[PDB]
mmCIF file of all heavy atoms in Angstrom:
data_model
loop_
_atom_site.group_PDB
_atom_site.id
_atom_site.type_symbol
_atom_site.label_atom_id
_atom_site.label_comp_id
_atom_site.label_asym_id
_atom_site.label_seq_id
_atom_site.Cartn_x
_atom_site.Cartn_y
_atom_site.Cartn_z
ATOM 1 N N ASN A 442 -119.043 205.691 -58.523
ATOM 2 C CA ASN A 442 -118.140 204.411 -58.475
ATOM 3 C C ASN A 442 -117.947 203.875 -59.837
ATOM 4 O O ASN A 442 -118.469 202.790 -60.100
ATOM 5 C CB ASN A 442 -118.812 203.495 -57.484
ATOM 6 C CG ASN A 442 -119.054 203.946 -56.061
ATOM 7 O OD1 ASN A 442 -118.053 204.289 -55.376
ATOM 8 N ND2 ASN A 442 -120.292 203.943 -55.696
ATOM 9 N N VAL A 443 -117.232 204.608 -60.653
ATOM 10 C CA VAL A 443 -117.029 204.211 -62.043
ATOM 11 C C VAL A 443 -115.862 205.106 -62.660
ATOM 12 O O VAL A 443 -115.818 206.337 -62.439
ATOM 13 C CB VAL A 443 -118.275 204.313 -62.941
ATOM 14 C CG1 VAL A 443 -118.990 205.687 -62.747
ATOM 15 C CG2 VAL A 443 -117.998 204.006 -64.411
ATOM 16 N N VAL A 444 -115.082 204.495 -63.556
ATOM 17 C CA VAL A 444 -114.010 205.153 -64.273
ATOM 18 C C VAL A 444 -114.407 205.365 -65.715
ATOM 19 O O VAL A 444 -114.373 204.461 -66.504
ATOM 20 C CB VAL A 444 -112.664 204.387 -64.213
ATOM 21 C CG1 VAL A 444 -111.659 204.894 -65.068
ATOM 22 C CG2 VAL A 444 -112.124 204.347 -62.887
ATOM 23 N N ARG A 445 -114.832 206.642 -66.039
ATOM 24 C CA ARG A 445 -115.193 206.993 -67.382
ATOM 25 C C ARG A 445 -114.066 207.611 -68.141
ATOM 26 O O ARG A 445 -113.229 208.179 -67.496
ATOM 27 C CB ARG A 445 -116.339 208.082 -67.404
ATOM 28 C CG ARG A 445 -116.014 209.297 -66.506
ATOM 29 C CD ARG A 445 -117.250 210.161 -66.399
ATOM 30 N NE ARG A 445 -117.168 211.226 -65.444
ATOM 31 C CZ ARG A 445 -116.421 212.369 -65.474
ATOM 32 N NH1 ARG A 445 -115.625 212.607 -66.505
ATOM 33 N NH2 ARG A 445 -116.487 213.171 -64.517
ATOM 34 N N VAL A 446 -114.044 207.332 -69.524
ATOM 35 C CA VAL A 446 -112.996 207.863 -70.312
ATOM 36 C C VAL A 446 -113.512 208.626 -71.444
ATOM 37 O O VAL A 446 -114.327 208.004 -72.269
ATOM 38 C CB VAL A 446 -112.051 206.755 -70.753
ATOM 39 C CG1 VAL A 446 -110.828 207.256 -71.477
ATOM 40 C CG2 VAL A 446 -111.521 205.945 -69.618
ATOM 41 N N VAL A 447 -113.156 209.934 -71.559
ATOM 42 C CA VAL A 447 -113.701 210.743 -72.650
ATOM 43 C C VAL A 447 -112.698 210.492 -73.861
ATOM 44 O O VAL A 447 -111.521 210.645 -73.835
ATOM 45 C CB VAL A 447 -113.743 212.185 -72.324
ATOM 46 C CG1 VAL A 447 -112.212 212.674 -71.865
ATOM 47 C CG2 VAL A 447 -114.216 212.967 -73.574
ATOM 48 N N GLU A 448 -113.427 210.179 -75.051
ATOM 49 C CA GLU A 448 -112.680 209.964 -76.204
ATOM 50 C C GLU A 448 -111.988 211.192 -76.632
ATOM 51 O O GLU A 448 -112.486 211.948 -77.537
ATOM 52 C CB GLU A 448 -113.648 209.438 -77.417
ATOM 53 C CG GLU A 448 -112.957 209.268 -78.736
ATOM 54 C CD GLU A 448 -113.820 208.558 -79.721
ATOM 55 O OE1 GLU A 448 -114.932 209.052 -80.010
ATOM 56 O OE2 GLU A 448 -113.385 207.544 -80.224
ATOM 57 N N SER A 449 -110.829 211.450 -76.062
ATOM 58 C CA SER A 449 -109.977 212.720 -76.345
ATOM 59 C C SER A 449 -108.571 212.446 -76.393
ATOM 60 O O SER A 449 -107.772 212.808 -75.535
ATOM 61 C CB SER A 449 -110.366 213.718 -75.280
ATOM 62 O OG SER A 449 -111.739 213.925 -75.012
ATOM 63 N N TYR A 450 -108.024 211.981 -77.576
ATOM 64 C CA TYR A 450 -106.698 211.750 -77.720
ATOM 65 C C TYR A 450 -105.957 212.896 -78.437
ATOM 66 O O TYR A 450 -106.565 213.867 -78.847
ATOM 67 C CB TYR A 450 -106.400 210.453 -78.495
ATOM 68 C CG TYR A 450 -105.371 209.583 -77.743
ATOM 69 C CD1 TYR A 450 -105.429 209.398 -76.349
ATOM 70 C CD2 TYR A 450 -104.372 208.855 -78.444
ATOM 71 C CE1 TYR A 450 -104.502 208.597 -75.773
ATOM 72 C CE2 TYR A 450 -103.553 208.092 -77.775
ATOM 73 C CZ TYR A 450 -103.523 207.920 -76.428
ATOM 74 O OH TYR A 450 -102.669 207.053 -75.721
ATOM 75 N N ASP A 451 -104.618 212.792 -78.500
ATOM 76 C CA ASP A 451 -103.895 213.882 -79.073
ATOM 77 C C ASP A 451 -103.040 213.459 -80.246
ATOM 78 O O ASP A 451 -102.344 212.505 -80.103
ATOM 79 C CB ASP A 451 -103.079 214.624 -78.029
ATOM 80 C CG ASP A 451 -102.266 213.633 -77.192
ATOM 81 O OD1 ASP A 451 -101.229 213.218 -77.625
ATOM 82 O OD2 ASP A 451 -102.577 213.424 -76.055
ATOM 83 N N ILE A 452 -103.160 214.125 -81.342
ATOM 84 C CA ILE A 452 -102.402 213.929 -82.453
ATOM 85 C C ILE A 452 -101.824 215.281 -83.100
ATOM 86 O O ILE A 452 -102.069 216.318 -82.430
ATOM 87 C CB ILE A 452 -103.106 213.161 -83.584
ATOM 88 C CG1 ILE A 452 -104.059 214.064 -84.260
ATOM 89 C CG2 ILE A 452 -103.790 211.860 -83.022
ATOM 90 C CD1 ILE A 452 -104.497 213.512 -85.645
ATOM 91 N N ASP A 453 -101.304 215.182 -84.259
ATOM 92 C CA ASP A 453 -100.818 216.486 -84.942
ATOM 93 C C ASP A 453 -101.665 216.667 -86.189
ATOM 94 O O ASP A 453 -102.509 215.871 -86.616
ATOM 95 C CB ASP A 453 -99.323 216.297 -85.367
ATOM 96 C CG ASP A 453 -98.371 216.778 -84.346
ATOM 97 O OD1 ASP A 453 -98.826 217.017 -83.197
ATOM 98 O OD2 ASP A 453 -97.151 216.890 -84.614
ATOM 99 N N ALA A 454 -101.500 217.914 -86.789
ATOM 100 C CA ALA A 454 -102.263 218.315 -87.884
ATOM 101 C C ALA A 454 -102.091 219.800 -88.104
ATOM 102 O O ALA A 454 -102.405 220.667 -87.295
ATOM 103 C CB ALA A 454 -103.741 218.134 -87.641
ATOM 104 N N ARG A 455 -101.444 220.136 -89.205
ATOM 105 C CA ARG A 455 -101.118 221.508 -89.560
ATOM 106 C C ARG A 455 -102.073 222.099 -90.672
ATOM 107 O O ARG A 455 -102.823 221.296 -91.200
ATOM 108 C CB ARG A 455 -99.666 221.598 -89.955
ATOM 109 C CG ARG A 455 -98.708 221.068 -88.911
ATOM 110 C CD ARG A 455 -97.306 220.770 -89.533
ATOM 111 N NE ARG A 455 -96.487 220.103 -88.581
ATOM 112 C CZ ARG A 455 -96.667 218.983 -87.909
ATOM 113 N NH1 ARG A 455 -97.855 218.292 -88.161
ATOM 114 N NH2 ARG A 455 -95.768 218.470 -87.136
ATOM 115 N N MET A 456 -101.864 223.338 -91.024
ATOM 116 C CA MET A 456 -102.656 223.893 -92.025
ATOM 117 C C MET A 456 -101.908 224.887 -92.926
ATOM 118 O O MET A 456 -100.604 225.033 -92.756
ATOM 119 C CB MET A 456 -103.894 224.703 -91.518
ATOM 120 C CG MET A 456 -103.524 225.851 -90.418
ATOM 121 S SD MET A 456 -103.141 225.330 -88.698
ATOM 122 C CE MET A 456 -103.333 226.809 -87.841
ATOM 123 N N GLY A 457 -102.465 225.555 -93.908
ATOM 124 C CA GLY A 457 -101.842 226.466 -94.716
ATOM 125 C C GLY A 457 -100.633 225.857 -95.495
ATOM 126 O O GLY A 457 -100.577 224.755 -95.741
ATOM 127 N N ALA A 458 -99.694 226.818 -95.788
ATOM 128 C CA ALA A 458 -98.471 226.345 -96.492
ATOM 129 C C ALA A 458 -97.736 225.261 -95.803
ATOM 130 O O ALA A 458 -97.514 224.175 -96.392
ATOM 131 C CB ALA A 458 -97.585 227.652 -96.738
ATOM 132 N N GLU A 459 -97.356 225.568 -94.557
ATOM 133 C CA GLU A 459 -96.642 224.540 -93.772
ATOM 134 C C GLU A 459 -97.236 223.192 -93.905
ATOM 135 O O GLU A 459 -96.541 222.204 -93.788
ATOM 136 C CB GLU A 459 -96.491 225.030 -92.265
ATOM 137 C CG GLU A 459 -96.538 223.870 -91.335
ATOM 138 C CD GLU A 459 -96.018 224.260 -89.925
ATOM 139 O OE1 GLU A 459 -96.505 225.289 -89.319
ATOM 140 O OE2 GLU A 459 -95.130 223.566 -89.419
ATOM 141 N N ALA A 460 -98.541 223.128 -93.909
ATOM 142 C CA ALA A 460 -99.298 221.863 -93.919
ATOM 143 C C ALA A 460 -98.722 220.890 -94.877
ATOM 144 O O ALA A 460 -98.241 219.795 -94.575
ATOM 145 C CB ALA A 460 -100.680 222.046 -94.219
ATOM 146 N N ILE A 461 -98.867 221.319 -96.150
ATOM 147 C CA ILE A 461 -98.287 220.429 -97.217
ATOM 148 C C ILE A 461 -96.812 220.364 -97.144
ATOM 149 O O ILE A 461 -96.247 219.397 -97.536
ATOM 150 C CB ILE A 461 -98.733 221.059 -98.576
ATOM 151 C CG1 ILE A 461 -100.102 221.695 -98.517
ATOM 152 C CG2 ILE A 461 -98.683 219.960 -99.587
ATOM 153 C CD1 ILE A 461 -101.167 220.825 -97.831
ATOM 154 N N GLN A 462 -96.124 221.448 -96.719
ATOM 155 C CA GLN A 462 -94.771 221.461 -96.651
ATOM 156 C C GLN A 462 -94.153 220.119 -96.125
ATOM 157 O O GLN A 462 -93.346 219.494 -96.654
ATOM 158 C CB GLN A 462 -94.297 222.631 -95.724
ATOM 159 C CG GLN A 462 -93.148 222.233 -94.709
ATOM 160 C CD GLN A 462 -91.935 223.141 -94.893
ATOM 161 O OE1 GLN A 462 -92.070 224.354 -95.060
ATOM 162 N NE2 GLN A 462 -90.787 222.444 -94.940
ATOM 163 N N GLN A 463 -94.736 219.728 -94.839
ATOM 164 C CA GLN A 463 -94.341 218.472 -94.282
ATOM 165 C C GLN A 463 -94.667 217.302 -95.077
ATOM 166 O O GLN A 463 -93.817 216.384 -95.402
ATOM 167 C CB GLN A 463 -94.940 218.311 -92.860
ATOM 168 C CG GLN A 463 -94.313 219.103 -91.689
ATOM 169 C CD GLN A 463 -93.129 218.416 -91.108
ATOM 170 O OE1 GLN A 463 -92.422 218.889 -90.204
ATOM 171 N NE2 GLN A 463 -92.843 217.195 -91.681
ATOM 172 N N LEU A 464 -95.984 217.298 -95.512
ATOM 173 C CA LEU A 464 -96.502 216.225 -96.370
ATOM 174 C C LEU A 464 -95.620 215.978 -97.572
ATOM 175 O O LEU A 464 -95.456 214.849 -98.021
ATOM 176 C CB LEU A 464 -97.892 216.586 -96.771
ATOM 177 C CG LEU A 464 -98.859 216.895 -95.607
ATOM 178 C CD1 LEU A 464 -100.042 217.648 -96.155
ATOM 179 C CD2 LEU A 464 -99.341 215.626 -94.923
ATOM 180 N N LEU A 465 -95.027 217.039 -98.177
ATOM 181 C CA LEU A 465 -94.121 216.902 -99.310
ATOM 182 C C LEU A 465 -92.828 216.146 -98.906
ATOM 183 O O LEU A 465 -92.599 215.157 -99.521
ATOM 184 C CB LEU A 465 -93.749 218.332 -99.813
ATOM 185 C CG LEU A 465 -94.758 219.001 -100.636
ATOM 186 C CD1 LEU A 465 -94.357 220.407 -100.940
ATOM 187 C CD2 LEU A 465 -95.059 218.272 -101.966
ATOM 188 N N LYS A 466 -92.073 216.665 -97.990
ATOM 189 C CA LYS A 466 -90.828 216.093 -97.614
ATOM 190 C C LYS A 466 -90.987 214.672 -97.209
ATOM 191 O O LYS A 466 -90.043 213.848 -97.413
ATOM 192 C CB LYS A 466 -90.217 216.832 -96.330
ATOM 193 C CG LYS A 466 -90.272 218.338 -96.516
ATOM 194 C CD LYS A 466 -89.580 218.948 -95.367
ATOM 195 C CE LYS A 466 -88.581 220.087 -95.673
ATOM 196 N NZ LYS A 466 -87.742 220.662 -94.575
ATOM 197 N N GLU A 467 -92.171 214.286 -96.630
ATOM 198 C CA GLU A 467 -92.410 212.907 -96.219
ATOM 199 C C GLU A 467 -92.606 211.948 -97.422
ATOM 200 O O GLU A 467 -91.630 211.319 -97.644
ATOM 201 C CB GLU A 467 -93.646 212.923 -95.363
ATOM 202 C CG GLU A 467 -93.455 213.675 -94.062
ATOM 203 C CD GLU A 467 -94.017 213.062 -92.784
ATOM 204 O OE1 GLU A 467 -94.790 212.015 -92.947
ATOM 205 O OE2 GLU A 467 -93.752 213.477 -91.606
ATOM 206 N N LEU A 468 -93.728 211.925 -98.029
ATOM 207 C CA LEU A 468 -93.945 210.919 -99.069
ATOM 208 C C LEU A 468 -92.805 210.532 -99.875
ATOM 209 O O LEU A 468 -92.192 211.438 -100.581
ATOM 210 C CB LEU A 468 -95.094 211.450 -99.962
ATOM 211 C CG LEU A 468 -96.525 211.156 -99.609
ATOM 212 C CD1 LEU A 468 -97.341 211.576 -100.742
ATOM 213 C CD2 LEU A 468 -96.727 209.658 -99.469
ATOM 214 N N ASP A 469 -92.373 209.277 -99.835
ATOM 215 C CA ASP A 469 -91.232 208.797 -100.603
ATOM 216 C C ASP A 469 -91.622 208.542 -101.895
ATOM 217 O O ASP A 469 -92.510 207.644 -102.225
ATOM 218 C CB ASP A 469 -90.738 207.453 -99.917
ATOM 219 C CG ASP A 469 -89.198 207.437 -99.745
ATOM 220 O OD1 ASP A 469 -88.471 207.667 -100.651
ATOM 221 O OD2 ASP A 469 -88.835 207.097 -98.602
ATOM 222 N N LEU A 470 -90.941 209.252 -102.858
ATOM 223 C CA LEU A 470 -91.240 209.258 -104.190
ATOM 224 C C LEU A 470 -91.321 207.816 -104.818
ATOM 225 O O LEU A 470 -92.190 207.366 -105.563
ATOM 226 C CB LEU A 470 -90.171 210.018 -105.009
ATOM 227 C CG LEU A 470 -89.176 210.916 -104.161
ATOM 228 C CD1 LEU A 470 -88.304 211.610 -105.052
ATOM 229 C CD2 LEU A 470 -89.983 211.964 -103.385
ATOM 230 N N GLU A 471 -90.241 207.001 -104.429
ATOM 231 C CA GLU A 471 -90.115 205.674 -104.876
ATOM 232 C C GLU A 471 -91.283 204.791 -104.380
ATOM 233 O O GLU A 471 -91.643 203.867 -105.089
ATOM 234 C CB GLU A 471 -88.782 205.041 -104.347
ATOM 235 C CG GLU A 471 -88.345 205.604 -102.956
ATOM 236 C CD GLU A 471 -87.445 206.899 -103.169
ATOM 237 O OE1 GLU A 471 -87.975 207.875 -103.705
ATOM 238 O OE2 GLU A 471 -86.357 206.875 -102.749
ATOM 239 N N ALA A 472 -91.912 205.174 -103.316
ATOM 240 C CA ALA A 472 -93.034 204.414 -102.769
ATOM 241 C C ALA A 472 -94.262 204.531 -103.605
ATOM 242 O O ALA A 472 -94.706 203.613 -104.199
ATOM 243 C CB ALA A 472 -93.412 204.830 -101.344
ATOM 244 N N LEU A 473 -94.788 205.825 -103.678
ATOM 245 C CA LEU A 473 -95.902 206.157 -104.510
ATOM 246 C C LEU A 473 -95.716 205.660 -105.971
ATOM 247 O O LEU A 473 -96.668 205.170 -106.557
ATOM 248 C CB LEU A 473 -96.160 207.654 -104.524
ATOM 249 C CG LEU A 473 -96.509 208.314 -103.204
ATOM 250 C CD1 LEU A 473 -95.369 208.296 -102.264
ATOM 251 C CD2 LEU A 473 -96.935 209.750 -103.496
ATOM 252 N N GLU A 474 -94.555 205.828 -106.541
ATOM 253 C CA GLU A 474 -94.245 205.402 -107.923
ATOM 254 C C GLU A 474 -94.618 203.895 -108.029
ATOM 255 O O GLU A 474 -95.242 203.573 -109.032
ATOM 256 C CB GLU A 474 -92.803 205.613 -108.300
ATOM 257 C CG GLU A 474 -92.558 205.530 -109.751
ATOM 258 C CD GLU A 474 -91.074 205.221 -110.133
ATOM 259 O OE1 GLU A 474 -90.330 205.094 -109.132
ATOM 260 O OE2 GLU A 474 -90.799 205.149 -111.249
#
C-alpha cells in the first residue's frame, strides 16, 4: 500500500564524432565570447 518511484528519467547524450558535432552547432559564438 505505497507508490514508489525509481529515480529513472530520460534525457539525451551522444558519443564519438557526432557527440561534439551537435555541441559545436549549438554553442552560440557571441554568447561564449
Side-chain angles (χ1 to χ4, degrees):
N442 300 299
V443 51
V444 173
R445 51 185 168 76
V446 184
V447 55
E448 176 170 57
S449 311
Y450 229 42
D451 50 76
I452 73 160
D453 271 8
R455 307 158 183 60
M456 58 279 198
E459 146 162 53
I461 325 312
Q462 138 119 49
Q463 277 281 178
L464 306 162
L465 282 172
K466 314 184 133 187
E467 298 219 349
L468 273 184
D469 226 308
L470 350 179
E471 30 273 60
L473 294 68
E474 194 203 1

